Amino acid sequence: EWQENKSWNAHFTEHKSQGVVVLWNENKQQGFTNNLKRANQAFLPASTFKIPNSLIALDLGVVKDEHQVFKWDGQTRDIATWNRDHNLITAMKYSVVPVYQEFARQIGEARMSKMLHAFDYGNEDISGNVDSFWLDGGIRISATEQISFLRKLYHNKLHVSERSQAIVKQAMLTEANGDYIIRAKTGYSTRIEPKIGWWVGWVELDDNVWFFAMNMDMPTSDGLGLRQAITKEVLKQEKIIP
Amino acid sequence: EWQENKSWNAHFTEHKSQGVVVLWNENKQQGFTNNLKRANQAFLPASTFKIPNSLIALDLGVVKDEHQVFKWDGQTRDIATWNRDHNLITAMKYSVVPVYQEFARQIGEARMSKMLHAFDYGNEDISGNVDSFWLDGGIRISATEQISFLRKLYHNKLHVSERSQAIVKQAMLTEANGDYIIRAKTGYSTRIEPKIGWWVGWVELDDNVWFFAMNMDMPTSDGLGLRQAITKEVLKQEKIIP
Ligand SMILES: [Cl-]
Structure with a gap:
């Protein structure tokens, strides 16, 4: 199914931006996002x-x-x-x-x-x-x-x-330590409006996998680092990573 | 070819332990170690x-x-x-x-x-x-x-x-970030003397790979973390990693 969790929206406004984070628990077959509309x-x-x-x-x-x-x-x-x-x-x-x-x-x-x-x-x-x-x-x-x-x-x-x-x-392969493995890819759309930044992939755990896909408003290149920062802030909130 | 670098022995004595670290530059086909002896x-x-x-x-x-x-x-x-x-x-x-x-x-x-x-x-x-x-x-x-x-x-x-x-x-896969990827495996021999800890693997770079293999005296399990710590300080000294 699909649960909406608007509490994650903070992480976007905390950087004066708007976007969506979409998680999927592979074991439970359940999805989570802050914006069901923008998720699609x-x-x-x-x-x-x-x-x-x-x-x-x-x-x-x-x-x-x-x-x-x-x-x-x-x-x-x-x-x-x-x-x-x-x-x-x-x-x-x-x-x-x-x-x-x-x-x-x-x-x-x-x-x-x-x-x-x-x-x-x-x-x-x-x-x-x-x-x-x-x-x-x-x-x-x-x-x-x-x-x-x-x-x-x-x-x-x-x-x-x-x-x-x-x-x-x-x-x-993007990040790997004793807690998780991240396989993902970034994106930066600029040639056609609206400019947005992507980060899509999944987080590997010992006994489960969390797929993720996010996009956010990216007017200038100064906020490209937020593609990973916001996503990771959501992951930690949901206790998927420390 | 093989060069000995006895300065690395400090990293062993600064944790008051003894062992060998063996590095191999694949691009240059050159080996480095602090003790050509224990290395073999x-x-x-x-x-x-x-x-x-x-x-x-x-x-x-x-x-x-x-x-x-x-x-x-x-x-x-x-x-x-x-x-x-x-x-x-x-x-x-x-x-x-x-x-x-x-x-x-x-x-x-x-x-x-x-x-x-x-x-x-x-x-x-x-x-x-x-x-x-x-x-x-x-x-x-x-x-x-x-x-x-x-x-x-x-x-x-x-x-x-x-x-x-x-x-x-x-x-x-052990560690991966924007600088390097480490693929390695640890070891802890205790049933026969001398008790030692192993760490063998390699460091992937954009345009090179450094193979490494080290062992050290491990009287108790309290120093198992030094297998990776000492190796990394050698990697940092040789400017292989930040
Ligand atoms: Cl991999």
Whole structure:
């Protein structure tokens, strides 16, 4: 089912912002959010799309494995970490758009479209640039739809090789300690209004898994750190993490 | 090549203990240690043997995957976390001996021996009880021999399935943040002198990997935390981590 908990809304206004956090207890099969409405609002995925793109790139052979290097094309860009060689792990760590734009071009309009249909991903609409539709195209996805897609990836139920799904879940590794493991991906939608920041993934525990997907209003880049801070503040409130 | 750095001995004496730390820069193919001697002295592997034990159990089907549950046998033991159900991830997280003792019995004397020979693991000698030879049997391994085994696992060069090595490398996940990822395993040998603590693994960086293996004198369990603490102070000294 689905319970609404508006107490979490504090964590958003405490930073003079608005957004939604959506949690899903896999063992109890129960969902929780502060805004049931916005939980189902579909937005541009932005860099969260690097998850399915990786799966498709790996499954079709565009990316052989997580060690293959993708040479910097030489064009100096405003994001410093982008102006260097990368592999799949580092490309996802620093959200290197140009690397995944090349992946999309090699994937192609036809194969990309069929795969998102197999994934049941968002509105399944890739209209726009094959190499930028997830930034300024027609694809839309809600927080709950992120949760549903991520759950499939966790259980290796997507229609790609088990190896492909493991590698992506490896590249999603973000934080790990004696208490929890976080596999997730961030996103920053700016090319089309409204500007929002994403953070989608799950928190692994000893005997349970909590999937999460959040988006928030992101007028400027000064609040990108809140994507993780607010989510973690909610996780701790619900005693999922210390 | 191999350089000795006796300055690291401070980190041992500042906690008034003695041991060896062995580092390996994979990119430069250079080794570093505070005691080239003890670096090659072979000890009982203790719970560090759970790495090769996991590999064999997965590759032979004793363990189907990292989700298969191994129910607590009902026997109360002094380690609280042992008196509960486990999977591969939690069994390795909490060094649950009873689970891997069952693995060994199902692996068997014969197959365990062939696999450790194929792995070139330690002295490859399993004399003793199949369910405790890594605790009080005849198997021995040195810090530098740990590095060689771990390096093979990193490159998926051991003679088991690539999937088997990926899952084990998942279960080895210990720490991960924006700076580094640590995949490692601890060990505590007590049944035969000298009592020691193990810590072997590697540190993943964006463009490099540092393998490490250390052991230290462990008269009481009060100093088990020094296995990780001393290693990390060496890592910090060498500017491998912040
Ligand atoms: Cl991992």
